[model samples]
Target chain A: GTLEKKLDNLVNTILLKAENQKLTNTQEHILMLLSQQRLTNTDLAKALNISQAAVTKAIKSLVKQDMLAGTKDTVDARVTYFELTELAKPIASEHTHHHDETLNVYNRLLQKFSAKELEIVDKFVTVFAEELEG
Target chain B: GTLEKKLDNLVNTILLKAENQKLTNTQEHILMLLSQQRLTNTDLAKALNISQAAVTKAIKSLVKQDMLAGTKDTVDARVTYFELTELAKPIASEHTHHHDETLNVYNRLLQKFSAKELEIVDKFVTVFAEELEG
Candidate 1:
């Protein structure tokens, strides 16, 4: 019950964070990803391991909000590229900084634990993911 | 990055599980709790660590779907208890099965890890949940 409850907390935290935000996690993550480099719908899909349709579906909202802008490639008639617009730069930057901050916190916490210790937890979650999939 | 990426995968996996069912894990948990006993909005909120306001809203959504029905107490007009409707029975029972199944797997693996090892993992999740709560 302890481990299961913690896993439930972990899932709720992620979902709550997304739901309470101005943008969904998908949108913030898109901005976060685009902060590093310009990307196509296919590129984002592959990077996030989501379908292109899903990628483009969120992108439509970003573009409508003027946070994302698309441009056609010069050589390819069907190719499109997406980038964070000027208004979106702050969000993109903050997303990166936020991730970096959380990454630091995670690293500090890991120093207190053993790799093998976490392996068990990983196994716990691995089975969890498998069960949730079913 | 390995640890964080594994966690990212976990989030994605839970999201898929949540989305496929038209119910987020929070909603599922709420239903699961109702299946066990009648509860007030504040009680549900406390158990889930969400606000009473949030608990009320989620209950509203569930009631709209006919999955939750609320009735006032006989002695007190202000007190109400919520229970799962017939429509929500399958969802709650299935959710309980998932919990039991995952727990069964966890029990099987307990022999493979030291208690100290799992504690550190719990510590990691506690801190991880704190960061994601924002």
Candidate 2:
């Protein structure tokens, strides 16, 4: 429960900011994804491991808010690639800053550990993440 | 970025399930807290480190959903204690199960580590959480 509580606190803080920005967690992830690259709806859904319908719903809401814009591929008219709007760019940048701030906590903590300890922690993180996905 | 991605994925998975259960992160936290013990709205807000309005909004929604019921102190009607409803008990149990399932990933990973390594990772988790809260 200790780790779970800490995880909840960290996640709650992240989502609180997103809520204040009038975005759902799904919407925030979509923006973060599109910030990295212009991805098709299908790609977004696949990367986020959610249903296309779920992705579409979040996309529709974001598009309605003018935070996302989509373009159809010239060669493949059926393919639509989504990208962050100018308005959304600032939000994405802000989220990136927040992400880095959160990661800094881990980085600073990692600094306190010796090489062997750091290696163990890193390995645990990697395997735990894999197990979580599994 | 990889660790961040994995963390985000895991969090997204947890929140997605909470969303399907029609609970906000704050509301879910409230239910979880009450599942552990009766608490006032003030205590809930403090434990969750959110605004009183945020707690009120979430509690109102949960009360309307019949997942929460509040009672007045016998001597002081102004003091309201909140608890989960019969409808909420199952939801809380489900969430607890989900929490354990998620924690199992960490437990399994820890099993792969030596005592010295486990000590290091545990220390890192403790400090990282503290830094996050700080």
Top-TM-score candidate index: 2
**CA error at residue A3 for candidate 2, angstroms:** 6.6
Clashing pairs in 2: none
Q: Candidate 2 lDDT, tens digit per residue, B3-104? A: 445444555664553342257767777898899999988998788777788889999999999999999889988899998999999988887776677566
Quality of model 2 by C-alpha lDDT? 0.72
Per-residue C-alpha lDDT of model 2 across residues A1-134, encoded as one tens digit per residue: 45445444554565553342278767877898889899999998788777788888989999999999989999999999998999999888887777677566555556687777766766766665445444
Candidate 2 vs. truth: CA RMSD?
3.7
lDDT of each: 0.74, 0.72
Error of 2 at B47 (Å): 4.4
What DockQ results do all the predictions give, each relative to the true complex?
Answer: 0.31, 0.37
Which regions of candidate 2 fall more than 4 Å away from where they truly are? A1-21, A46-51, B1-21, B46-53
Q: Candidate 2 chain B: worst 10 consecutive residues by lDDT?
A: B13-22
A15-57: candidate 1 lDDT, tens digit per residue: 6545423575677778888988898999987776666777887
Q: Positional deviation of B116 in candidate 2, in angstroms?
A: 1.8
